[PDB]
Paper text:
In this parasite, threonine degradation pathway occurs within the mitochondrion, where the amino acid is initially oxidized to 2-amino-3-ketobutyrate (AKB) by a NAD+ dependent L-threonine dehydrogenase (TDH, 1.1.1.103) and then cleaved into glycine and acetyl-CoA by a 2-amino-3-ketobutyrate coenzyme A ligase (AKCL, 2.3.1.29). Finally, we report the crystal structure of TcTDH and characterize its allosteric activation by potassium. The tertiary structure of TcTDH comprises two domains composed of alternating protein segments. The cofactor-binding domain adopts a characteristic Rossman motif and contains both catalytic residues, Thr-130 and Tyr-155.
Crystallographic structures of recombinant TcTDH without natural ligands (apo-TcTDH) and in complex with NAD+ and acetate (holo-TcTDH) were determined and refined to 2.1 and 1.73 Å resolution, respectively. In both crystals, asymmetric units (ASU) comprise two polypeptide chains, related by a non-crystallographic symmetry two-fold axis. The two protomers in ASU correspond to the homodimeric biological unit. For apo-TcTDH, the initial 12 residues of chains A and B and the terminal two residues from the C-terminus of chain B were omitted. The potassium-binding site is situated opposite to the catalytic site. In TcTDH, K+ is observed in octahedral coordination established through interactions with residues in the catalytic domain (Glu-221, Pro-222, and Ala-288) and cofactor-binding domain (Trp-291, Pro-292, and Asp-293). Four interactions are established between K+ and the main chain carbonyl of Pro-222, Ala-288, Trp-291, and Pro-292, and two interactions with the side chain carboxyl of Glu-221 and Asp-293. Although not directly interacting with K+, residues His-289, Lys-140, Asn-142, and Thr-143 formed a secondary layer of hydrogen bonds that imposed additional constraints on this region. Collectively, these interactions connect the largest loop of the N1 segment with residues in the N3 segment and with the potassium-binding site. The potassium-binding site of TcTDH superposes with a methylation site in mTDH, both located between the catalytic and cofactor-binding domains.
Author numbering:
A (entry chain B): 13 to 330
B (entry chain A): 13 to 332
């Protein structure tokens, strides 16, 4: 049974991944870490199996790996699109340096090492329709720039430093738990919230701007499946993974068809749109399907049905 | 005329560029820095116009920018291909952090900022024949990795941070002044010296491995023309520049033809070969031609003639 260290585990992915992996391998085989103690409202709060770690601090990072001796590492800490634009200095600091520490430690303590990439690695030259795994990368965000670095140094580690580095490019990840932030793709989450509170939604992404999206369980399914795969199946270190591609208009319709009551949406083109427009419309994830059996269970309507049921439950909502 | 700060100036390009700009703009216009005191026998030795700078020290970097108050920055420090495989940590430390500091400084002090990229940015997926400016980048060296980062953050600074960032992808750069060492593309220099000394050369690059190469004068031509170009001609931030491509066997033929005598070469694969194999065979530099008028004056035979006259004079090797 894998011994699992997750870093940056307070995030949506880290939280759900902690829970899935406890269920899967038992609570004692999983150690989650992040900068601060879980907030009292957060799903990991109070609970044990949690450790403080600043991933920027290499010695503390090495100590934790020497102590716990994980066989799998999930290095999740990142500054994403939004905050990345507001503080490029921080983004480059955390994303680059902590990634370098993760890889060095995976090399030295022989860990299977997952560090996620993102659709933000792509920019407007990617070929926006069914974007291939191998293509021109011209990210127009710092976050994107850092994640391309991650992709390249990680792949370098796999090819030349015998390091079992593995990665996917996450599209927009949708989740019922994630209280909805400011990030590009978070509009999807926001829309469901508003639809349940019966308020008008203010959408900063163009009505007809398509984005690759993925529902959390399929995302978690993918990450775990890739982590369980055989080195000899993996022709690549970094894999696009897809759920579905949609525009705000199509998501609105999904939600309307499900609720049989209409949802008011005002398109107010924020900086999210300019970033979104530089990203792919849809992703080709055939290398993932082929190499290691990636699959998805949720189409837009199932996700809609689920989210519209799960939010009231998790958030004490109508 | 511009005020020029060159960092990492003790390398071939730094030195040669320092001289060209001393010439072009006047010695008091140019300041050159590197980590170490210039060697005894070095073009920038002794005289003023040279300063120690550790570019990984941001405060020292800013201080020197505050003192000298340049308008042109040429950030040239880098650990390159071969040394980077041996010291990947040092390569990323300097290649990434120094680059980051120069961009920040050039933004803040409004400098036109040149930071070279390289053919090492490319990997075996680039499309190796006439490699385009826009292609798949899968570098297999630490150096290449750090230079792709350079291109992307530099391009990001240009689009979003109002920073006059400009770059070329250097092919392997040949100069008569460079003393032949262990660098990825150094075989070409070695062949020239061995020709004149009349000794056998053991070549670590495969006999038929093509590489984009460029003669120093055309390299300096390109950088200076690019650094002088009007912003509104620059459709991109980073541009392939090319001179010629050739294999070891083609370079040797050029040398033989010129010297009217055989050059003895033995091909024993060294570490340069797997690096070189992952690089383009030839570059497409049409965008540099079109946008800002990049041009070249040396083909291989004209570089061969020049090298074979220049090396005897610069190094005291036996002349033709
Ligand atoms: K898009
Ligand atoms: K080649």
């Amino acid at each position: 049974v894998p011994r699992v260290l997750i870093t940056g585990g307070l995030g949506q992915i880290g939280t759900d991944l902690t829970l899935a992996l406890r269920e899967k391998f038992g609570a004692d085989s999983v150690l989650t870490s992040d900068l601060v103690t879980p907030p009292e409202k957060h799903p990991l709060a109070g609970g044990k199996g949690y450790q403080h770690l600043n991933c920027m601090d290499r010695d503390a990072y090495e100590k934790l790996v020497k102590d716990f001796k994980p066989t799998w590492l999930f290095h999740l800490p990142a500054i994403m699109s939004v905050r990345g634009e507001a503080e490029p200095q921080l983004a480059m600091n955390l994303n680059i340096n902590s990634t370098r520490h993760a890889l060095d430690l995976a090399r030295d303590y022989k860990m299977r090492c997952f560090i996620p990439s993102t659709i933000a690695a792509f920019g407007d030259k990617c070929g926006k329709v069914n974007t291939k795994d191998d293509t021109i990368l011209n990210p127009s965000t710092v976050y994107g720039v850092t994640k391309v670095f991650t992709e390249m140094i990680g792949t370098y580690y796999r090819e030349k430093m015998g390091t079992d580095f593995r990665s996917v490019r996450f599209p927009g990840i949708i989740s019922a738990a994630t209280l909805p932030g400011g990030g590009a793709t978070d509009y999807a989450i926001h829309m469901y919230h508003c639809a349940l509170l019966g308020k008008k939604y203010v959408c900063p992404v163009r009505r007809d701007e398509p984005l690759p999206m993925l529902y959390m369980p399929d995302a978690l399914g993918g990450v775990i499946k890739l982590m369980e795969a055989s080195d000899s199946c993996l022709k690549r270190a970094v894999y696009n993974i897809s759920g579905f591609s949609f525009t705000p208009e199509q998501l609105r319709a999904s939600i309307e068809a499900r609720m049989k009551r209409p949802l008011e949406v005002e398109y107010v083109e924020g900086p999210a749109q300019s970033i979104a427009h530089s990203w792919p419309d849809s992703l080709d994830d055939s290398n993932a399907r082929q190499d290691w059996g990636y699959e998805t269970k949720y189409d837009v309507d199932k996700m809609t049905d689920d989210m519209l049921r799960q939010i009231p439950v998790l958030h004490g909502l109508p």
